[model samples]
Target chain A: LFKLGAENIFLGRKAATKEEAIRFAGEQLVKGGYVEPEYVQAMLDREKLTPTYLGESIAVPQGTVEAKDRVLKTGVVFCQYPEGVRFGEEEDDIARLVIGIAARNNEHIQVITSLTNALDDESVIERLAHTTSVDEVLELLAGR
Target chain B: SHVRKIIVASDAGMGSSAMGAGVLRKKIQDAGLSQISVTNSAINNLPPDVDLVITHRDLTERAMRQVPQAQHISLTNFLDSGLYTSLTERLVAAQRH
Candidate 1:
């Protein structure tokens, strides 16, 4: 199961480009001891293949399948950018909340399941974009 | 025809694919649709028993190329909960006929 603790959540950050956002997310994963340094570039390469924008102002950035070897553990980091970061060519593709992921084998089920259930409502997603309370985010993503 | 199994296909099959599958499952069950199951798999690893396949619009081609016979829903936004509503509605309508 993936837990979003205070250390894993970064609030009020800025990313000039999507690359900057991805690198920051990947770095957080590394800081959390979830992945290695190489996983950061792997995330960039993965982005080159296709963007990780999951809509509703949320973007999930993870490494490529080949980059699985770089993972040290299964974990995720939540980076909230109230200003929003543009993830694609479209104006509406701005991602206010970014979820960086590192998973080995099948340990990601809870993360994905809880993420889907927690952010199922658009209003919750919108609230998370600018929330100052880490507990609030934690409660929302507790997966019920 | 009745649909029994739906697969959410993605590149890694674990990240976005599983995420989408969770949302899909909840909405279907919430709609009172039972006996229909949802799972996730890599685009190239799709099973032959799948009745429907869902993929990101970017990966739809690869998913289709892998499972040519299965019905496909190319989602632009896999996490959009509205997809859950629309898909369960389709399944419900498909069952009604």
Candidate 2:
């Protein structure tokens, strides 16, 4: 039931730090009209509270509940960091894929479930980390 | 005897917060350790019977202050971690002892 169109996907993007990676993802969501510009700072604040750096080189950036007003719709933006971005306090917790989410109410719950299920597979995550093709990434996520 | 009850807490509005706890609860049930109850609630509303508390790192200090007797495992990344499997194994093994 979760759909991520090609327009929402960014492949082989370069980012120097976690904030830049978040900004890159947030920009895509903003451009898509999925979220307001202020939603970017909301995502950053949520990260400061709890790092979204899930294992397997994936980080999910989302706004906190208090920032729900910033979301225009329920959508997702995928920003692939080929150069890797540090998401955790430790230098080793680098993330190659960053998914920015703007969910209206609980509308994105199923989307989050599907995403987490796909990420649970270490093999799938490994492939995502190294893949250069947007089509391939789309296929992987689409099947989920 | 080590862990009679496990309490999983997350921020109120975070969707993944309750989802993470549900995943762990299912895994625990599947392991045939139903005797050990796992309940999910808000970080600030921890039950008094909890012996082990799992939650996000940001609320760890606050959770600890409320339930200092319980063992706490604060996660930086709750969804990606193999916490469900690992916690099930640890609790089951402890039950056998």
Which structure among the candidates has the greatest DockQ? 1
For each candidate in turn, the TM-score is 0.87, 0.77
- Candidate 1 segments exceeding 4 Å error: A106-110, B14-19, B76-86
Report the number of the highest-TM-score candidate: 1
Screening candidate 1 with a backbone cut-off below 3 angstroms (N, C-alpha, C), the clashing residue pairs are: none
Question: Model 2: what TM-score?
Answer: 0.77
* Residues B2-95, model 2: lDDT tens digits: 5668776666425445456557776777878878786565676787778888877777888898988779877655554475667667777877
How far is A44's C-alpha from truth in model 2 (Å)? 1.3
lDDT of 2 at A27: 84
The DockQ scores of all candidates, in the order shown, are 0.49, 0.29
